Ligand binder design. Structure first.
Ligand SMILES: [Cl-]
Ligand code: NA
Length: 129
């Protein structure tokens, strides 16, 4: 599913991401825009053989099982394919674990390079929330 900007903001808010670990909603929308272009079906393979999955590009080396990342963990206790669903619940629940892991949203490279320090409230402007 490709979400609209305000549609995704509303779904993220309903699932508890606004101000989760101190990160306002616009940070999460900005990260999703640059990680996946709001597309739940996005995948990207990394040089180490791991793959990033879904709207927040969650990586199989640590967070989900895809059966093809040797030596990896599955800390979210999910198949990686669950992160591609039109329902973002599994992605949000796993993102909550990631952002709690010590580095905050710096875990998302696109957030650190394209969202951090910018006017992230622009991403929720005009939305009925
Ligand atoms: Cl947009
Ligand atoms: Na933090």
């Amino acid at each position: 599913k490709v979400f609209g900007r305000c549609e995704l903001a509303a779904a993220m808010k309903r699932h508890g991401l606004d101000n989760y670990r101190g990160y306002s909603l616009g940070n999460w929308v900005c990260a999703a825009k640059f990680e996946s272009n709001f597309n739940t079906q996005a995948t990207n393979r990394n040089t180490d053989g791991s793959t990033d999955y879904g709207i927040l590009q969650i990586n199989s080396r640590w967070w989900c099982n895809d059966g093809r990342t040797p030596g990896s963990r599955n800390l979210c206790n999910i198949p990686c394919s669950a992160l591609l669903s039109s329902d973002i619940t599994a992605s949000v629940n796993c993102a909550k674990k990631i952002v709690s892991d010590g580095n905050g949203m710096n875990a998302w490279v696109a957030w650190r390079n394209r969202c951090k320090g910018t006017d992230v409230q622009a991403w929720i402007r005009g939305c009925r929330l």
